[PDB]
Enzyme design. Structure first.
Site, PDB file in Angstrom:
ATOM      1  N   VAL A  99     -49.882 -38.402   7.109  1.00  0.00           N
ATOM      2  CA  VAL A  99     -50.364 -38.519   5.847  1.00  0.00           C
ATOM      3  C   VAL A  99     -51.572 -39.052   5.602  1.00  0.00           C
ATOM      4  O   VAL A  99     -52.122 -39.821   6.437  1.00  0.00           O
ATOM      5  CB  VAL A  99     -49.396 -39.807   5.521  1.00  0.00           C
ATOM      6  CG1 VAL A  99     -49.277 -40.366   4.003  1.00  0.00           C
ATOM      7  CG2 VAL A  99     -47.658 -39.533   5.942  1.00  0.00           C
ATOM      8  N   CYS A 100     -52.006 -38.700   4.372  1.00  0.00           N
ATOM      9  CA  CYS A 100     -53.430 -38.947   3.895  1.00  0.00           C
ATOM     10  C   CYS A 100     -54.340 -38.784   5.083  1.00  0.00           C
ATOM     11  O   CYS A 100     -54.530 -37.818   5.799  1.00  0.00           O
ATOM     12  CB  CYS A 100     -53.367 -40.204   3.254  1.00  0.00           C
ATOM     13  SG  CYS A 100     -54.535 -40.871   2.349  1.00  0.00           S
ATOM     14  N   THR A 101     -55.205 -39.760   5.253  1.00  0.00           N
ATOM     15  CA  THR A 101     -56.524 -39.913   6.370  1.00  0.00           C
ATOM     16  C   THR A 101     -55.736 -39.747   7.695  1.00  0.00           C
ATOM     17  O   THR A 101     -56.655 -39.439   8.674  1.00  0.00           O
ATOM     18  CB  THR A 101     -57.299 -40.765   5.960  1.00  0.00           C
ATOM     19  OG1 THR A 101     -56.829 -42.153   6.031  1.00  0.00           O
ATOM     20  CG2 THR A 101     -58.273 -40.593   4.875  1.00  0.00           C
ATOM     21  N   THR A 119     -56.020 -33.517   3.765  1.00  0.00           N
ATOM     22  CA  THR A 119     -56.056 -34.799   3.866  1.00  0.00           C
ATOM     23  C   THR A 119     -56.576 -35.539   2.575  1.00  0.00           C
ATOM     24  O   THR A 119     -56.651 -34.869   1.508  1.00  0.00           O
ATOM     25  CB  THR A 119     -57.549 -35.196   4.913  1.00  0.00           C
ATOM     26  OG1 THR A 119     -57.184 -36.545   5.378  1.00  0.00           O
ATOM     27  CG2 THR A 119     -58.816 -34.917   4.173  1.00  0.00           C
ATOM     28  N   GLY A 148     -49.846 -33.898   4.853  1.00  0.00           N
ATOM     29  CA  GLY A 148     -49.576 -34.149   3.413  1.00  0.00           C
ATOM     30  C   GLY A 148     -50.716 -35.395   2.803  1.00  0.00           C
ATOM     31  O   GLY A 148     -50.906 -36.126   3.836  1.00  0.00           O
TER      32      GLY A 148
END
Lengths: 226, 226
Positions: A99-101, A119, A148
């Site tokens: 997820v994300c970073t 990212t 994602g």
């Protein structure tokens, strides 16, 4: 019993983890682990205190591993113990997710080399130096890898994982049980839809973090080059 | 500093709380409290362990109170200490909010009498006996009361609260920082959109809980009638 593990680290963005945790914990015949160096308290970036349930050494072989993001990603990208654990689990996992970073941690572990990935929008330039093919899409799949964007990406891709691990009817049941039907009151969740003035405020606030992560990313890339 | 409090109770549905917590904790000049009878560990319905930060007695006057839902709602609806705290805080709060079955706790406290409100679809019949005007909409406002449906209702209404406490640009900034742009892979988050077979599975699985909550609701309504 499907074994699902989340990496829980200091300065995690907790919603990246707690969203998919509550969805996947709703499924039958699933055990969910919160993994760190030892069981015990771990503080999220907001100050929320969470509790790791297992150590690296004691964690069972996982079917799904999920790496959340947050402030704390910078330290993880140079934590040899954490990176070795992620590589060991990714070798046999059916799904490797972030997820994300969190995808920057997969990058530092060498798991994005030659792989399509995304990212967080403010850090997207750091994917190419970690060997990734950068993609500007909210969910990017490449084989068993799923990256994602968005603090709630893991809620959405948890429903995809439910459908593939079980069946579509099981995923639909969980969605209905949770009455999950989001409707944000603003449309500023992408730099392509937000007002230019808002994108400027957000970039300026991320600038110090991005500068530090450029330095960390180059050291992580040097280790992959060895 | 805006004071925001969440009730944290055993068997809470943690995402009802942790979603709006991470959004609101991103705002400047906000202090967020996790409130229970004493500071210390509280276990969510999934087994996730959270940590209450303050007691009822020590909690400051709140600008925003938020009641999450979960399995644990049934016990709360007959907890005189919790209900008295909610009534005291609601008297002066700028916003009184709930997620999912948290509105049944507001109902047991007497705060829905003559008010438009919603709750989780499987329990919606319990609103009228608590004096509410039942409304089948995802977010229902009546004055300073805001009730929402869906495990992530609090993420969406947290952006509304950010815009009203601060300004629209602040809410948009937070949305962009979090890259919040959900896109569920299924459309089964309402009994009106899910397949009939899935609605049957979900109703049958909720039936024992609904039966017990009918009994609790009638006792709670008797206390309001006194």
């Amino acid at each position: 019993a499907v074994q699902i593990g989340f990496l829980l680290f200091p300065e995690v963005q907790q919603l990246d983890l707690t969203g998919p945790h509550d969805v996947l914990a709703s499924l039958p015949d699933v055990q969910v682990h919160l993994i760190w160096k030892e069981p015990g308290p771990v503080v999220a970036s907001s100050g929320l205190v969470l509790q790791a349930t297992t150590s690296f050494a004691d964690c069972p072989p996982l079917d799904v591993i999920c790496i959340p993001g947050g402030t704390g990603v910078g330290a993880l990208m140079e934590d040899p113990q954490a990176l070795a654990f992620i590589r060991q689990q990714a070798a046999r996992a059916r799904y490797v997710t972030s997820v994300c970073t969190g995808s920057l941690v997969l990058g530092a572990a060498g798991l994005l080399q030659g792989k399509r990935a995304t990212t967080h929008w403010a850090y997207h330039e750091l994917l190419a130096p970690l060997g990734a093919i950068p993609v500007h899409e909210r969910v990017v799949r490449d084989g068993n890898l799923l990256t994602g964007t968005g603090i709630t990406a893991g809620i959405d891709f948890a429903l995809t994982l439910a459908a593939e691990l079980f069946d579509a009817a099981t995923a639909q049941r969980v969605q209905l049980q949770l009455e999950y039907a989001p409707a944000p009151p603003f449309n500023a969740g992408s730099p392509d839809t937000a007002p230019a003035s808002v994108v400027q405020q957000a970039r300026q606030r991320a600038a110090d973090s991005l500068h530090k992560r450029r330095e960390i990313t180059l050291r992580a890339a040097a280790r992959l080059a060895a």
